[PDB]
């Protein structure tokens, strides 16, 4: 069968379809090691499976859109955590202990008029 | 005028002898800032 | 510079005056305000008084001036 989930982080959106299998994580019709050629990014994406010892037990298909690499990896991690919670509701405390299921609401602040940036001000003198 | 003196020392007087009345005021400020 | 497809920019009235003087064979001074006009080979040997804002600076065109604008020889600002 299929388990559907969605994660969000900044401008990145991840839609994750999870199914029974062994190890195939396919992102945008690409392998995980080819889409994310960074050990840190791969670890971020595959964090909840390693925490719940559910690795080597599923196939995941991910559709990511928007943002950069870190935002996309965090969104994918959130989506995988939500899918795991949907599959088994008893792992919610374990995932909460690490915070994989909390939606981080931090976004880029709007630039304000009369200022070079959101908070940085001009040199008064 | 305005002394630099790290922190500002500004004064302004309006008269025909402003260049001296301002100096009197600034002398008062400098003495008060001495200690 | 100016695109080569458009050719050089030369004031038509000023050029007509210069060729009229060439055909006549006489010598005189041509008073002009066309500071942006390019100097052509037909301009060599004449005297052209170019306006600079408040007077007419006279220029005697030589062969090394061909291809330069007329305003490069009539400075507009006075400094001392």
């Amino acid at each position: 069968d299929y388990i559907n989930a969605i994660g969000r982080r900044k401008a990145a959106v991840a839609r994750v379809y999870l199914s029974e299998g062994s190890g195939k994580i396919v992102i945008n019709k690409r392998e995980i090691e080819q889409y994310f050629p960074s050990s840190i990014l791969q670890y971020i994406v595959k964090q909840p499976l390693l925490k719940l010892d559910v690795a080597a037990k599923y196939d995941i298909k991910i559709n990511l859109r928007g943002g950069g690499f870190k935002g996309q990896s965090e969104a994918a991690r959130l989506a995988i955590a939500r899918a795991l919670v949907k599959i088994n509701p008893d792992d919610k405390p374990a995932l909460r202990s690490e915070g994989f299921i909390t939606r981080d609401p931090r976004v880029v602040e709007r630039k304000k008029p009369g200022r070079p940036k959101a908070r940085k001000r001009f040199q008064f003198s | 005028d305005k002394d630099v003196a790290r922190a500002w020392l500004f004064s302004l007087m309006e008269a025909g002898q402003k260049s001296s009345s301002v100096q009197r005021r600034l002398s008062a400020l400098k003495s008060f800032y001495k200690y | 510079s100016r695109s080569l497809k458009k050719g050089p920019y030369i004031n038509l009235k000023l050029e007509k005056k210069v060729l009229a003087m060439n055909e006549s064979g006489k010598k005189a001074v041509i008073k002009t305000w066309a500071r942006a006009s390019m100097i052509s080979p037909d301009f060599v040997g004449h005297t052209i008084a170019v306006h600079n804002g408040n007077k007419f600076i006279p220029v005697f065109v030589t062969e090394n001036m061909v291809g330069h604008k007329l305003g490069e020889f009539s400075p507009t600002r006075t400094f001392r």
């Binding site: 050990s39 840190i40 971020i44 915070g99 | - | -």
Partner: protein
């Protein structure tokens, strides 16, 4: 704020050190510098120890104890922060080819108990012991 475990060692102290090391938000560059420095450390002092153990011992060696605000005790978090900042700052000040090489040299020196960071710590200790009466 939350601190991510280090990808290689699973430590928060490593991530904090990289955060101190980072310029302009280039965390990948800072991580590469730190891992490289550990590599020269393990290739040079190859010592019946580990690569991260030497770094931890160096931080513990160059950490200070008391700080004159009159002397007073130091919180553990400020102690760790000042130790990391001192190590990085003197590594930057010292000469060398690459930042990884400079950091590895300073880590080795701090472990071997001599260096600019240790000199700074000893000077702070002397300035602290100078004012024992007002304490």
């Amino acid at each position: 704020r939350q601190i991510l475990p280090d990808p290689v060692y699973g430590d928060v102290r490593v991530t904090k050190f990289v955060n101190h090391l980072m310029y302009d938000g280039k965390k990948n560059t800072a991580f590469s510098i730190f891992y490289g420095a550990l590599d020269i450390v393990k290739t040079k002092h190859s010592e019946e120890k580990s690569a991260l153990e030497i770094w931890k011992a160096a931080l513990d060696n160059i950490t200070p104890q008391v700080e004159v605000k009159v002397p007073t005790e130091i919180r553990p978090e400020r102690k760790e922060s000042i130790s990391m900042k001192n190590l990085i700052l003197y590594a930057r000040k010292r000469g060398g080819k690459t930042m990884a090489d400079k950091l590895a040299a300073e880590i080795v020196d701090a472990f071997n108990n001599q260096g600019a960071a240790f000199k700074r710590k000893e000077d702070m200790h002397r300035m602290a012991e100078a004012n024992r009466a007002f304490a």
